[PDB]
């Protein structure tokens, strides 16, 4: 009997998870160039099918989290980093389900607008991905994607408030508001989450500085 | 001077949260049934009832994981159990409570179908809390209410779409509209919560596989 | 080469983190009081600020647990006091957001009380912080806090159920009833979350017990 030593590739897996979240999220720009019902349904079950590996990818992580005692860095930040990328693909799903059960007007610029922002932060995240075995030797370009993820969720919060702000002067049909509120929501939260994957990345820094 | 063993006994706490689970679904079902205020109330009042309870054995097992070196299986998932149980038990709550406030039109089929289908998950989540014992020497029937909890929630899932989207299609008064829609949110939410118990169940069986 | 002590300062952090969370509810209660919009994006972005600053004493909170191996009482705890301090102070926050975007019709009484019971909540939470040094020896002050705001909460919730069932069964104009449901439910989130405070503080004292 001999030692065989356990391969947790910590950092593969996130990676892994970080591309299926891109990839999730270039599906949601092109799905909101599409205005029917047929189109979307293709979508967000393309999207759904992200979200299923999503979450195994991420069950995966904490399962190899919870039998390896050796982790390259504190294993709450790496619990967190897989929960937070998880829940922003679960946004961008939850967002191509409720474009296709309310069944809206051609979404407007905005909302395409949000779309391009979370493909935006998921292409930070991805990056920031690439930094997690050298920014204990050099944080300055991992410090750089978590200041750009700030200042996306900034610009996607302006674009929402000021959506919504104009929705309730502007919208007379309740039914209509109703539903592109909801879609909005669901956008703006994604765009939150994916700040949140920034945010633990930064503290990582502080931790190991 | 003598050594006194600490009896917590964190499967009959697990399984004492689900018996409160399954009782709480078996009222929301039988709730639908009225639709009158008064009889709302008195099944909302019962709910909470519940609720209270099952926050209580939900804080008594942190608790005890807090103050004991030794568990059956990872503290985590005992912890995560049990928060995601009762989190079960809340949206159960939040669903009857929604019903009163907002007091809509009897109830439909399908609210009624998601009632069944959260006391279907309850009966599910309580055949596996008999598992947590034997898992370990053969996991396939917990793997197997594993299993139906995922189909659960796919039916669950696809009643509140259809539902929602033709609602949309159909319901002309708006404020008729808020009020079911808020009511059906609260219930797919959580037949949602349900199977992420099933989901913790899974990944122990994977963690000590 | 000598040893240098670290000098976390758990309570002092947590005290600060509090009397962020106090100057914001002071806010929010003020807040209210006016009905223009300019005086509305005022305040929201006075409520911001100290939201930034809330953010900010958490992570700190968060970063120098991650690093210190010795703490007064059990991490968990001291995590998750500054996690929930941070929800009240990001409710509110959403809650002065809320009356921005959606630009509603002077709140009403019962807006204006959930505002002073989140006050009312948030002056209770800096008493119990106030007693984490000394709940060891004398629980029963803190205690008698935790008490208050279960209680604070039970009231807070019945404004909310209340105004809602009458905004039910009155207002007409789905679109003013939509903005005004929005923001009460952002309050009775808020005042939810800091009972939830008041819980882990129950429970701090049980396992100490």
Same mark, same amino acid.
């Not at 702000?165 to 703006?188: G, V």
């Given at each position: 009997?001999?030692?065989?030593?356990?391969?947790?590739?910590?950092?593969?897996?996130?990676?892994?998870?970080?591309?299926?979240?891109?990839?999730?999220?270039?599906?949601?720009?092109?799905?909101? %160039?599409?205005?029917?019902?047929?189109?979307?349904?293709?979508?967000?079950?393309?999207?759904?099918?992200? %979200?299923? %590996?999503?979450?195994?990818?991420?069950?995966?992580?904490?399962?190899?989290?919870? !039998?390896?005692?050796?982790?390259?860095?504190?294993?709450?930040?790496?619990?967190?980093?897989?929960?937070?990328?998880?829940?922003?693909?679960?946004?961008?799903?939850?967002?191509?389900?409720?474009?296709?059960?309310?069944?809206?007007?051609?979404?407007?610029?905005?909302?395409?607008?949000?779309?391009?922002?979370?493909?935006?932060?998921?292409?930070?995240?991805?990056?920031? *991905?690439?930094?997690?075995?050298?920014?204990?030797?050099?944080?300055?370009?991992?410090?750089?994607?978590?200041?750009?993820?700030?200042?996306?969720?900034?610009?996607?919060?302006?674009?929402?408030?000021?959506?919504?702000?104009?929705?309730?002067?502007?919208?007379?049909?309740?039914?209509?508001?109703?539903?592109?509120?909801?879609? *909005?929501?669901?956008?703006?939260? !994604?765009?939150?989450?994916?700040?949140?994957?920034?945010?633990?990345?930064?503290?990582?820094?502080?931790?190991?500085?």
């Amino acid at each position: 009997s001999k030692f065989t030593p356990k391969e947790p590739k910590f950092f593969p897996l996130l990676k892994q998870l970080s591309d299926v979240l891109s990839a999730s999220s270039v599906l949601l720009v092109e799905s909101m %160039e599409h205005d029917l019902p047929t189109e979307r349904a293709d979508y967000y079950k393309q999207i759904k099918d992200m %979200e299923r %590996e999503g979450d195994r990818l991420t069950h995966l992580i904490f399962d190899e989290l919870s !039998t390896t005692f050796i982790t390259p860095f504190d294993r709450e930040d790496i619990h967190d980093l897989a929960s937070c990328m998880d829940d922003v693909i679960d946004g961008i799903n939850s967002s191509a389900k409720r474009i296709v059960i309310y069944n809206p007007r051609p979404i407007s610029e905005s909302g395409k607008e949000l779309s391009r922002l979370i493909h935006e932060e998921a292409i930070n995240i991805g990056k920031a *991905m690439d930094e997690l075995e050298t920014f204990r030797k050099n944080p300055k370009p991992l410090r750089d994607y978590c200041t750009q993820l700030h200042d996306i969720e900034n610009q996607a919060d302006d674009v929402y408030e000021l959506f919504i702000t104009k929705l309730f002067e502007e919208e007379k049909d309740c039914i209509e508001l109703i539903k592109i509120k909801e879609i *909005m929501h669901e956008l703006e939260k !994604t765009t939150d989450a994916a700040e949140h994957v920034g945010k633990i990345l930064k503290n990582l820094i502080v931790k190991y500085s």
